[PDB]
Design a protein around this ligand. Structure first.
Ligand SMILES: [Ca+2]
Ligand SMILES: [Ca+2]
Lengths: 588, 588
């Protein structure tokens, strides 16, 4: 067998606590090299301490091959142990029938293994629920809607910035434009959100800042006055909550804006500033050489987000900064009852801070949702002591690549499988899936205005384990290239809205919330049934939901389903190129 | 190539911060399958943000194959980056010359890789020294001596337990025997320790407890009165410190003894006890059925260490228990200036507690040494936020197995290589290497009283990266089977001491402290030079120390070294079976 392809990392996503007496264990092997895996497991102390002749290694537990990423196969088993201590090893058999035991001590013939020595085995030493990953259940039933507040709705012309342009969803906005969107506009259109069926709003930053996007924070403790005030934000959160809609705000803690009191004090007082060590300043005075691009300097004497001199990086290892940021994070939860924080550039802040943040939030709200913005693999933030989830850009990016280009269905299924096996099962269900955002081109533009393709992408994404999000205006087919063009004023004129797409998105949201969210502990299965043809199944003990996606260039015929939930062709059996069909069937 | 055998786990022992601008990166591949590995790495934002034509991926960095465990090869490189943000990927070429790029997105031909997208790469997002592993430098120069205080020296008959037996190192002690050893006895023999050359004392538990081993704690805040009192312990620590000897105490925090105030309160008051939730009680009253073995019950209604009813497990997730234990840990450091804590059964206490413990200790003493007793792989406790090191029983156990049985030298070198590549390089230098202890048979008994074999085992262990420890009496050749027989009264009668072994151990301690500890940033190399013949090299930029060990059944001839440090044969060129020779040479 391919022994170099076999690996088990103890105390990780491959061995973790699910409840006081139960653990999940995984093994990686080389694809199709290993025929079978059994787990030998039990209480380490039982081997020598108990007077019985029975030994735990005499009754193996079968492991199941659950996924493959094209390189490796992944196997899993759930183990229950009342003594809440576990020693375990793997019996692996390859395609030629060669069997070995694999343990913390390496690879052995069974006859050579020291099975009576507890230290031979991998260990889960005591099942610690304080250390385990917990998923908040309310997120399961959520469909999110992301609002970039400058561009959603102007409900109050009297707070508009100087130079505000007329509201025109056909504009191509520049980087410094204002259209006057604000919190009253969101309040004004809560009926639209409830009619669409969404149950969570994600706001981009709303705190005082000079820009239209407000990531260059001036004051974290004040709603930007062009958006509203504290009273209005409280009214908005209560009105959302009354409609069953949770609220997630954007925490911009990696850097502060250069018009903040703190940075302005550094510019006035240099190293004598009380805030000098709140930042990462290499040489005083803190300076840079301006260029023709506001957002770029080649030589700032302080660390920044990217290379923009207007966003000095915060020193989150400084205990005064930790206290400042934790007080901000507490204030908005305690005084306004928000339900979640989305963490901007969360990977560039240290784990020590995020553990303190996690502890503070869970002490306020044990079901709080902490969402990190990270575009690469995120295992070390998703153990259960830092974030709940991340924005799942690697996963939706792979979906986009499949639908928009011409890779094989095998390639896509390999990539999604790889992703899921990076994380604990409950973590995968908390991941935040959005196909586009204020940082990407719009879906309808990526699809070259092919609405059928856009519907397929959205439906495929809405069938995945993670929770889906709709970027404002997707439901009417808004177009746009990348930032700033993906931030057009929301389309409120009916002549300019795609009503068919809105109707479709209402139906899709209903399949997600009424069917997919209501299965119990389901299994997801990816089947490649032909060239660019995929069958996705989610199933529990009672019911199976199946979606077939034909993204080749030929017609596909399927058996007429008894209960079709959603389809694009008028036929109940034939799928043309880029059609899909979702149905439900009982499990037999 | 064997792609299933290639793996890089970001933010782990394969990618970690060594200082503000420097990181160490590792890759695993299948043994001898990959010919070369280059790293492509640089600031993620530099790709699109900088106006230059240069891109970081145009100048690869060569990685070096540093170890092999017989299954996998391990490659390493050190990278410096002034922007303190790193994106990286690996260029791997197999034995047939097939080259691929391996990144967070998987495996690609170079021509197909999206090298301009920062999200293609693995990431070290910002170099966080607050999250990094730190090794205390004083441990580098230490050789430890482990004292089981009941059995080292009786310096005060007036505190002896009732039934104390006459001091006789030829006795076979029973599990409940007392010989009257105490803290005054240790004070009385500090000259012996200084003459041997040791610079750290590890004491087994000294707090009030009814047994001879005192792991069944009655009161953590009081020195056991058969050992001494607070004044005497302060005198002992100051006297040790005056001689350049650090002091490590045993923290028994996984369980408490059943004669403690807390457990006795549970027995009196059942669930109405203020301490009921300090424990893991499944059913009240807390009870068990006694057996003929004091240390075993089959049905205790509360969790215990092993199956002994006298050691109820502490609930370290309870904040009252956390506070109690942290106060104890603080008290002995603050009031008595101890230098380290050894943590008994440390794996069965939760990571949340150990992070709080770590933070508390480092705030008192930034160079504190935290040593966990764990007999299996310990990666998740050695990241830099919990322990400094563990008792390195997997490593010394492999050494013992080689010298005492007849496996190949390749097998041993594979096992040691596997061990070292589990951990960060600095961690490996902090590991605590003892060949025997109060929990194992004695070295001289394992060696069947073959003193030459015992000398080889000790010398081989003392050349390893971790810090060595001598269990009391090893230096005079004490014998003993496992506990309780490994706890004989210390041999103080000269007629019964092996003076040749004591002389040898003085010389060996001097090679460790004067030569091996004084190299700068050295490399360790394991060479198998013949059947059961091993050449161990440690070398820095100026000097190389080489040890050759002949453990076959034939003579071995080596070149006459110019500067021999330590050898067992009278010859300067010939090694008989089980001889060794250590020398030093300049690096050319
Ligand atoms: Ca307005
Ligand atoms: Ca005494």
């Amino acid at each position: 067998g391919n022994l170099a392809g076999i690996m088990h990392r103890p105390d990780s996503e491959m061995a973790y606590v699910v409840n006081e007496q139960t653990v999940n264990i995984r093994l990686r092997t080389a694809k199709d090299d290993i025929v079978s895996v059994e787990l030998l497991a039990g209480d380490p102390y039982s081997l020598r301490s108990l007077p019985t002749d029975e030994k735990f290694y005499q009754v193996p537990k079968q492991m199941t091959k659950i996924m493959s990423d094209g390189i490796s196969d992944f196997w899993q088993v759930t183990v229950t142990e009342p003594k809440r201590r576990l020693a375990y090893a793997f019996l692996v058999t390859d395609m030629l029938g060669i069997q070995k035991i694999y343990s913390d001590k390496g690879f052995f013939k069974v006859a050579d293994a020291d099975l009576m020595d507890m230290n031979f085995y991998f260990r889960m030493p005591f099942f610690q629920t304080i250390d385990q990953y917990n998923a908040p259940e309310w997120v399961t039933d959520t469909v999110w809607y992301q609002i970039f507040p400058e561009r959603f709705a102007n409900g109050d012309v009297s707070n508009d910035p100087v130079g505000t342009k007329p509201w025109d969803s056909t504009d191509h906005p520049g980087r410094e434009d204002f259209y006057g969107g604000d919190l009253q506009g969101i309040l004004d259109h809560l009926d639209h959100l409830q009619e669409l069926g969404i149950s969570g709003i994600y706001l981009n930053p709303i705190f005082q800042a000079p820009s239209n996007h407000k990531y260059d924070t001036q004051d974290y403790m004040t709603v930007d006055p062009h958006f509203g005030d504290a009273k209005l934000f409280k009214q908005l959160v209560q009105a959302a909550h009354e409609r069953g809609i949770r609220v997630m705000l954007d925490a911009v803690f990696n850097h502060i804006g250069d018009k903040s009191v703190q940075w302005q004090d550094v510019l006035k007082n240099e190293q004598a500033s009380p805030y000098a060590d709140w930042f990462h300043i290499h040489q005083f005075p803190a300076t840079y050489t301006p260029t023709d691009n506001f957002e770029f300097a080649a030589d700032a004497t302080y660390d920044t987000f990217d290379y923009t001199p207007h966003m000095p990086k915060l020193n989150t290892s400084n205990p005064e900064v930790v206290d400042y940021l934790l007080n901000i994070a507490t204030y908005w939860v305690k005084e306004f009852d928000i339900d979640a924080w989305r963490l901007n550039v969360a990977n560039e802040i240290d784990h020590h801070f995020w553990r303190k943040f996690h502890d503070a939030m869970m002490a306020l709200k044990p079901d709080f949702y902490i969402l990190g913005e990270i575009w690469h693999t995120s295992q070390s933030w998703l153990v259960g002591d830092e974030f709940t989830a991340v924005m799942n850009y690697s996963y939706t990016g792979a979906i986009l690549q499949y639908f928009l280009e011409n890779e094989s269905a095998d390639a896509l299924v390999q990539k999604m499988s790889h992703q899921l096996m990076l994380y604990r099962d409950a973590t995968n269900r908390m991941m935040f899936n959005t196909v586009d955002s204020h940082d990407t081109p719009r879906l309808m533009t990526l699809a070259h205005e092919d609405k059928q393709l856009a519907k397929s992408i959205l439906t495929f994404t809405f069938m995945q384990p993670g929770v889906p999000s709709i970027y404002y205006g997707t439901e009417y087919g808004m177009t746009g290239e990348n930032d700033p063009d993906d931030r057009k004023p929301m389309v409120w004129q009916p002549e300019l809205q795609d009503h068919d797409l809105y109707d479709f998105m209402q139906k899709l949201v209903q399949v997600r919330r009424q069917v997919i969210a209501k299965l119990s502990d389901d299994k997801i299965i990816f089947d490649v049934i032909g060239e660019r043809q995929i069958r996705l199944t989610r199933e529990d003990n009672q019911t199976r939901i199946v979606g077939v996606f034909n993204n080749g260039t030929t017609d596909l015929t399927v058996a007429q389903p008894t209960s079709i939930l959603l389809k694009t062709n008028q036929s109940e059996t034939q799928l043309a190129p880029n059609d899909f069909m979702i149905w439900t069937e009982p499990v037999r």
